Structure formats: C-alpha cells, structure tokens
Design a protein around this motif. Sequence first.
Motif, PDB file in Angstrom:
ATOM      1  N   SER A   1       0.749  -1.110   0.152  1.00 28.86           N
ATOM      2  CA  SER A   1      -0.015   0.005   0.059  1.00 28.86           C
ATOM      3  C   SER A   1       0.945   1.387  -0.008  1.00 28.86           C
ATOM      4  O   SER A   1       2.079   1.004   0.256  1.00 28.86           O
ATOM      5  CB  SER A   1      -0.794   0.103   1.298  1.00 28.86           C
ATOM      6  OG  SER A   1      -0.108   0.383   2.258  1.00 28.86           O
ATOM      7  N   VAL A   2       0.152   2.205  -0.111  1.00 28.91           N
ATOM      8  CA  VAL A   2       1.338   3.696  -0.196  1.00 28.91           C
ATOM      9  C   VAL A   2       0.355   4.853   0.573  1.00 28.91           C
ATOM     10  O   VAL A   2      -0.283   5.471  -0.185  1.00 28.91           O
ATOM     11  CB  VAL A   2       1.198   4.146  -1.514  1.00 28.91           C
ATOM     12  CG1 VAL A   2       1.887   5.433  -1.642  1.00 28.91           C
ATOM     13  CG2 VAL A   2       2.305   3.149  -2.239  1.00 28.91           C
ATOM     14  N   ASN A   3       0.705   4.953   1.785  1.00 30.64           N
ATOM     15  CA  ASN A   3       0.023   5.913   2.493  1.00 30.64           C
ATOM     16  C   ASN A   3       0.805   7.313   2.417  1.00 30.64           C
ATOM     17  O   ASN A   3       2.006   7.305   3.194  1.00 30.64           O
ATOM     18  CB  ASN A   3      -0.009   5.571   4.166  1.00 30.64           C
ATOM     19  CG  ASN A   3      -1.572   6.207   4.759  1.00 30.64           C
ATOM     20  OD1 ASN A   3      -2.294   6.783   3.983  1.00 30.64           O
ATOM     21  ND2 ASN A   3      -2.111   5.537   5.819  1.00 30.64           N
ATOM     22  N   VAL A   4       0.477   8.392   1.688  1.00 33.00           N
ATOM     23  CA  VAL A   4       1.206   9.537   1.855  1.00 33.00           C
ATOM     24  C   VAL A   4       0.429  10.532   2.667  1.00 33.00           C
ATOM     25  O   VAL A   4      -0.381  11.284   2.110  1.00 33.00           O
ATOM     26  CB  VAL A   4       1.226   9.914   0.454  1.00 33.00           C
ATOM     27  CG1 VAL A   4       2.441  10.869  -0.068  1.00 33.00           C
ATOM     28  CG2 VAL A   4       1.423   8.701  -0.505  1.00 33.00           C
TER      29      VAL A   4
ATOM     30  N   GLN B   1      -5.842  15.367   2.248  1.00 33.36           N
ATOM     31  CA  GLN B   1      -4.720  15.802   3.023  1.00 33.36           C
ATOM     32  C   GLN B   1      -3.740  14.727   2.795  1.00 33.36           C
ATOM     33  O   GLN B   1      -2.358  14.680   2.841  1.00 33.36           O
ATOM     34  CB  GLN B   1      -5.098  15.922   4.527  1.00 33.36           C
ATOM     35  CG  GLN B   1      -4.256  16.952   5.073  1.00 33.36           C
ATOM     36  CD  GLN B   1      -3.381  16.445   6.062  1.00 33.36           C
ATOM     37  OE1 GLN B   1      -3.026  17.120   6.981  1.00 33.36           O
ATOM     38  NE2 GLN B   1      -2.895  15.391   5.800  1.00 33.36           N
ATOM     39  N   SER B   2      -4.429  13.396   2.814  1.00 34.88           N
ATOM     40  CA  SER B   2      -3.370  12.418   2.739  1.00 34.88           C
ATOM     41  C   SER B   2      -3.580  11.367   1.628  1.00 34.88           C
ATOM     42  O   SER B   2      -4.830  11.550   1.101  1.00 34.88           O
ATOM     43  CB  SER B   2      -3.123  11.481   4.093  1.00 34.88           C
ATOM     44  OG  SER B   2      -4.425  10.374   4.009  1.00 34.88           O
ATOM     45  N   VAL B   3      -2.857  10.342   1.140  1.00 35.75           N
ATOM     46  CA  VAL B   3      -3.524   9.449   0.044  1.00 35.75           C
ATOM     47  C   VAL B   3      -3.064   7.945   0.556  1.00 35.75           C
ATOM     48  O   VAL B   3      -2.023   7.439   0.054  1.00 35.75           O
ATOM     49  CB  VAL B   3      -3.013   9.965  -1.417  1.00 35.75           C
ATOM     50  CG1 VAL B   3      -2.925   8.883  -2.301  1.00 35.75           C
ATOM     51  CG2 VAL B   3      -3.400  11.228  -1.668  1.00 35.75           C
ATOM     52  N   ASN B   4      -4.031   7.101   0.927  1.00 31.94           N
ATOM     53  CA  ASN B   4      -3.807   5.814   1.330  1.00 31.94           C
ATOM     54  C   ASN B   4      -4.264   4.890  -0.042  1.00 31.94           C
ATOM     55  O   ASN B   4      -5.473   4.764  -0.130  1.00 31.94           O
ATOM     56  CB  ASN B   4      -4.607   5.410   2.562  1.00 31.94           C
ATOM     57  CG  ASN B   4      -3.820   4.414   3.505  1.00 31.94           C
ATOM     58  OD1 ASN B   4      -2.458   4.081   2.967  1.00 31.94           O
ATOM     59  ND2 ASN B   4      -4.062   4.282   4.573  1.00 31.94           N
ATOM     60  N   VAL B   5      -3.327   4.556  -0.493  1.00 32.08           N
ATOM     61  CA  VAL B   5      -3.487   3.513  -1.900  1.00 32.08           C
ATOM     62  C   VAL B   5      -3.303   2.106  -1.284  1.00 32.08           C
ATOM     63  O   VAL B   5      -2.129   1.591  -1.507  1.00 32.08           O
ATOM     64  CB  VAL B   5      -2.616   3.606  -2.714  1.00 32.08           C
ATOM     65  CG1 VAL B   5      -3.380   3.475  -4.100  1.00 32.08           C
ATOM     66  CG2 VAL B   5      -2.484   5.343  -3.110  1.00 32.08           C
ATOM     67  N   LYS B   6      -4.238   1.135  -0.930  1.00 34.88           N
ATOM     68  CA  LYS B   6      -3.968  -0.175  -0.432  1.00 34.88           C
ATOM     69  C   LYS B   6      -4.285  -1.166  -1.709  1.00 34.88           C
ATOM     70  O   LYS B   6      -5.348  -1.118  -2.373  1.00 34.88           O
ATOM     71  CB  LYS B   6      -5.085  -0.638   0.758  1.00 34.88           C
ATOM     72  CG  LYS B   6      -5.131  -2.013   0.713  1.00 34.88           C
ATOM     73  CD  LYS B   6      -5.013  -2.513   2.235  1.00 34.88           C
ATOM     74  CE  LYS B   6      -3.490  -2.174   2.813  1.00 34.88           C
ATOM     75  NZ  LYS B   6      -3.646  -2.824   4.154  1.00 34.88           N
TER      76      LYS B   6
ATOM     77  N   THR C   1      -7.355  11.425   2.948  1.00 35.40           N
ATOM     78  CA  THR C   1      -7.718  11.932   4.218  1.00 35.40           C
ATOM     79  C   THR C   1      -7.832  13.423   3.983  1.00 35.40           C
ATOM     80  O   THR C   1      -7.041  14.154   4.042  1.00 35.40           O
ATOM     81  CB  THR C   1      -6.665  11.633   5.168  1.00 35.40           C
ATOM     82  OG1 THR C   1      -6.698  10.256   5.507  1.00 35.40           O
ATOM     83  CG2 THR C   1      -6.972  12.709   6.518  1.00 35.40           C
TER      84      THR C   1
ATOM     85  N   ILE D   1      -3.904  11.253  -7.207  1.00 34.88           N
ATOM     86  CA  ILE D   1      -2.709  10.943  -6.750  1.00 34.88           C
ATOM     87  C   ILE D   1      -1.511  11.507  -7.422  1.00 34.88           C
ATOM     88  O   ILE D   1      -0.721  12.526  -6.735  1.00 34.88           O
ATOM     89  CB  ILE D   1      -2.561   9.323  -6.859  1.00 34.88           C
ATOM     90  CG1 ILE D   1      -3.279   8.483  -5.999  1.00 34.88           C
ATOM     91  CG2 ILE D   1      -1.016   8.917  -6.715  1.00 34.88           C
ATOM     92  CD1 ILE D   1      -4.910   8.880  -5.766  1.00 34.88           C
TER      93      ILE D   1
ATOM     94  N   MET E   1      -1.136  14.708  -5.490  1.00 41.65           N
ATOM     95  CA  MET E   1      -0.254  14.839  -4.112  1.00 41.65           C
ATOM     96  C   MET E   1       1.096  14.523  -4.214  1.00 41.65           C
ATOM     97  O   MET E   1       1.856  15.301  -3.845  1.00 41.65           O
ATOM     98  CB  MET E   1      -1.153  13.415  -3.506  1.00 41.65           C
ATOM     99  CG  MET E   1      -1.854  14.147  -1.969  1.00 41.65           C
ATOM    100  SD  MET E   1      -0.897  14.847  -0.858  1.00 41.65           S
ATOM    101  CE  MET E   1      -0.429  13.381   0.006  1.00 41.65           C
ATOM    102  N   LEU E   2       1.460  13.725  -5.173  1.00 42.07           N
ATOM    103  CA  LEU E   2       2.763  13.431  -5.378  1.00 42.07           C
ATOM    104  C   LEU E   2       3.377  14.655  -5.509  1.00 42.07           C
ATOM    105  O   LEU E   2       4.439  15.112  -4.937  1.00 42.07           O
ATOM    106  CB  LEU E   2       2.888  12.594  -6.654  1.00 42.07           C
ATOM    107  CG  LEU E   2       3.601  11.361  -6.253  1.00 42.07           C
ATOM    108  CD1 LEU E   2       3.325  10.252  -7.273  1.00 42.07           C
ATOM    109  CD2 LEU E   2       5.314  11.416  -6.313  1.00 42.07           C
TER     110      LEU E   2
END
Lengths: 73, 73
Positions: A25-28, B24-29, B43, B63, B66-67
């Motif tokens: 996964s990738v949590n940013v 605010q955040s980006v969780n990619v599972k 988030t 995504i 955010m990067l």
Amino acid sequence: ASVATELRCQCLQTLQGIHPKNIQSVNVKSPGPHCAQTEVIATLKNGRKACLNPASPIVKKIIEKMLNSDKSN
Amino acid sequence: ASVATELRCQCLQTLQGIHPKNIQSVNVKSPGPHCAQTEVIATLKNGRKACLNPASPIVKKIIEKMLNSDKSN
C-alpha cells in the motif's frame, strides 16, 4: 473514533526507499499542524510498513510505480 | 498490534474523486488476499477520509497531484 490533538509525524523517520514489489500500500500523509514535512508510507505485502523519504528520487518513484500497479486488469 | 485474518476492502465503496485541495493524505491499498480491487483513499484536511475509484481518471489524477504536493519547499 480517533481524533484529539493526537497527530504525530506518522513517519518520524524515513528510508531512502525500497522495491515496489516489497510494498503493498502507499500512505502519503501531507504535512499539516502536526508535521511540516511530507511523510510517505508503504505497507509491505507481509503486513509490515515502512516510511520513505519523499525528498529522495527512489521514494517519488515508489509512488509513481504503485499508481501503475492499478492499471486495468 | 492488529493482524488476524481481519482485512476487508478498506474501500468497500468509492467516489468518482474530489479536488486535491480537500484531501490531505493518500492511502492506496493494493489488492491482495482481502480485496482483488485496488482501493485509493484520501484523508481530507478536516480529519475526514474518502475512498476514490482508481479506475476513474479523476482518481488517478488525485494521486499524481498529491505526489507534486511534496516537491521541495
């Protein structure tokens, strides 16, 4: 559920990076009122997690890679 | 800590996407032994979270955006 001035740099530390095959996964978590430094995270495929440095080139590629990991199928 | 055949599609549902300023955040599972469908997460900056669809174009851009959000400063 979980919210009360309890936000610490999810990635107090960071790793130069790692292969995109060991991650899952990738949590940013961007920087805010708890961490003025971006914090990237990678959940290995073994239920493990590892924070990476978004200032390095390998980390920026760790994300750009996962993105493709989900390209049709 | 937290691990025992307890992995449900972190994003049972998904949203076409949303502006990168509300996140605010980006969780990619990625998909695994719990969800064969990628699951993107964002988030919001209000302690809120919203799952997005990695099959849509707005999500893939959520995504990629955010990067850049973390590009020197």
